[PDB]
């Protein structure tokens, strides 16, 4: 083949995570892979990034790069813009231990790292396992996608959010393009007293599934299919445009009459 | 009955947060304005968290500190933690709405997915009134951003806003008299940011700064960038759904075409 694929691999769980190390191993059978990922498994970074401080990096013997206290986004940013020359063809983020579905996606560091490689020659993949077991299956599904992208370019969609059923590969039904489901608002806080009687608060579990119908990511994964949802960064709720303009006129905001 | 700019000194309960933290001039100016006519509770980060984006604290609990005036700082809390805790635990009576702001600096374009200002408003989307994220295009005219936010809040008192759960509001950094009006906008977009600034530590290790956002790419006439450049307050309604609906078919055809995951 005329060209090697050069892949920037990141994740949310840090460089030591088995999900990213399993995927790296699988990708390296056919691709060049540079890992740039958080130094440790931190929870809940979303697409935060480090602006108030400079970031420190560390290179392992195998060449993996960990960014110290780096967010998922930090790592992809540094990887694309400084640490990999020339720039990667594609950012692959995963494999995440745990699903990234529905309206959770915006909170996902795994998705954020992909999000950050949306301007490369291929659409970025965010890869999450619905579980902790079959990294092998998600690795294989990722490999298949990537061979697919190199066979024919995907013309529209700069980020693909891929959720893989936690099954042995032979039981995965196939792949469906899906939209993000939704959840009810999350509302649990779990209070816990410290030894001095002060109340500290844990953020609780997500809200219950609300939109999990036939074409959602939630449905696809439950039915044993890989879910693929293309994502974009534009948060515009266009359907609300007229209602909002009409409301402002109605309440006299921005207009004198 | 009596004629005043606002009807009631505490007609609505507002959870006010931001991402610059509880000491920020943005939030303090706004708080003072809102307290004219609203029952305001500040729940905000203990310090600056710009580009905390929608992150949240899941593997540790959080501790709060309450100031003399009743402001709550969530110690190391992200803007999302603050709203989530304020809404779901701390506030009684619960808020009618979340206001987030006034941020020192704009939250325009494809930057909005990175804004902690916007993330706090996004955590308040389920409440009765749409959550407002208010960011000043600059550092000067907090007064102007406060007047704008007060005008939208009074407006919500006149008539509820039916569709649209977050409103991202950018306000030109001008005296109020020079703001031309309001536009309902769409998010513009930027080129990829591409600068990384290296800086040696005292030991000669190279550390890296994240550079500024990339150039404007789409600043067309109905965008938030254009509105603010032209001296209008931009209001973009936002959602949290990241699905690229208009890419669905293309992706679907692509998969069929290369046959990934299908036997033949
Ligand atoms: N990629 C990026 N996105 C948002 N804000 C930034 N500031 C610097 N780089 C940025
Ligand atoms: Mg994770
Ligand atoms: Mg800020």
UniProtKB/Swiss-Prot annotation, chain A:
Query: Could you tell me the keywords of this UniProt record?
Result: Cytoplasm, Hydrolase, Metal-binding, Nucleotide-binding
The prosthetic group or cofactor this protein requires is:
a divalent metal cation
Q: Name one GO cellular component term.
A: cytoplasm
EC number annotated for this UniProt entry: 3.1.3.5, 3.1.3.6, 3.6.1.11
Positions contributing to a divalent metal cation binding: 12-13, 43, 96
Q: What is its main location?
A: cytoplasm
Q: Which GO terms describe its molecular function?
A: 3'-nucleotidase activity; 5'-nucleotidase activity; exopolyphosphatase activity; metal ion binding; nucleotide binding
Cite the Pfam families for this sequence: SurE
Q: Which InterPro entries match?
A: SurE, SurE-like_Pase/nucleotidase, SurE-like_sf
Q: Catalytic activity, per the record? A: a ribonucleoside 5'-phosphate + H2O = a ribonucleoside + phosphate; a ribonucleoside 3'-phosphate + H2O = a ribonucleoside + phosphate; [phosphate](n) + H2O = [phosphate](n-1) + phosphate + H(+)
Q: Where in the cell is it found?
A: Cytoplasm
Q: Please name the top-level EC class of this enzyme.
A: hydrolase
Source domain of life is: Bacteria
NCBIfam families per the UniProt record, alphabetical:
PRK00346.1-1 (NF001488), PRK00346.1-3 (NF001489), PRK00346.1-4 (NF001490), surE (TIGR00087)
Q: What does this protein do?
A: Nucleotidase with a broad substrate specificity as it can dephosphorylate various ribo- and deoxyribonucleoside 5'-monophosphates and ribonucleoside 3'-monophosphates with highest affinity to 3'-AMP. Also hydrolyzes polyphosphate (exopolyphosphatase activity) with the preference for short-chain-length substrates (P20-25). Might be involved in the regulation of dNTP and NTP pools, and in the turnover of 3'-mononucleotides produced by numerous intracellular RNases (T1, T2, and F) during the degradation of various RNAs.
Q: Which PANTHER family match?
A: 5'-NUCLEOTIDASE SURE, 5'_3'-NUCLEOTIDASE SURE
Spell out the family assignment given in the record's similarity comment: Belongs to the SurE nucleotidase family.
Annotated protein name in UniProt: 5'/3'-nucleotidase SurE
Which species expresses this protein natively? Answer: Salmonella typhimurium (strain LT2 / SGSC1412 / ATCC 700720)
